[PDB]
Symmetry: C2
Subunit: 147 residues, 2 copies
């Protein structure tokens, strides 16, 4: 069972990070919503969500090896996904204002590919700025260019 597998692997993996961490998994058909409670959630999220995404990525790889490609795992804690997405949209609109006035390119902080496409989608038809992904790996980020 894909649900009981996550409760065993992710559950034991969260115990290695924090004995206070609790896992709650919900099945929405294809999407598996995993919620982490208890302990130091700020340390589990990590700097810019790197720790949360590293835990999420490893759990996705092991899940995909034993249950095909169908399922999709979404890891969250303390409503971090909602805040991170709102923060991304705030950074894109403020960088568009900063670049449109200073006339200089602004290198946004490094963010995962999912958040980079949102910045590209938000500033897609902005009349004053253009976007472009630069860097490799953990350094890959969005750069806001003046048109």
């Amino acid at each position: 069972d894909p649900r009981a597998f996550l409760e065993e692997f992710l559950g034991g993996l969260l115990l290695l990070l924090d004995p206070g961490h609790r896992l709650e998994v919900r099945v929405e058909g294809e999407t598996l919503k995993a919620e982490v409670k208890g302990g130091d959630l700020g340390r589990f999220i990590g700097k810019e969500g790197r720790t949360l995404r590293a835990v999420e990525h490893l759990a996705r790889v092991v899940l995909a090896r034993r249950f095909g490609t169908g399922y999709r795992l979404v890891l969250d804690a303390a409503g971090y996904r909602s805040r991170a997405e709102a923060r991304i949209r705030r950074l894109a609109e403020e960088a568009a204002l900063t670049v449109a006035m200073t006339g200089e390119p602004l290198h946004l902080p490094p963010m995962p590919p999912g958040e980079r496409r949102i910045v590209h989608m938000l500033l897609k038809n902005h009349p004053r700025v253009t976007t472009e992904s630069q860097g490799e790996g953990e350094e890959r980020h969005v750069v806001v260019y003046p048109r």
Copy 2:
């Protein structure tokens, strides 16, 4: 101690993947060499080393949070790093021959940023082919173009 930390976190993480997995950590100053033995090493490596790199990446993130930026963790099993690096150099030279004859671009398989730079470095001054990284995230790969 950075060494005893890996033996506890990675050790317990390997047990979640395979009870037969054993961990041996060697300290070479800045570099921490972690060796995995026992169990199904083919399943621990995973498809194209994705499982090994996902375990390695998560262990690097948690290690960096508790021990600064100095240390560098290198995870290996069954001499996979030596074979993967030799395979990368074989793919770069064969793709250079294939492209130089067919006249068509060849999209190499997706590989991590470390292996992509080796392909770029190997075909850097090749007189018949040029290279370029395309794609995002797990789809980012090297493309061999005819000059």
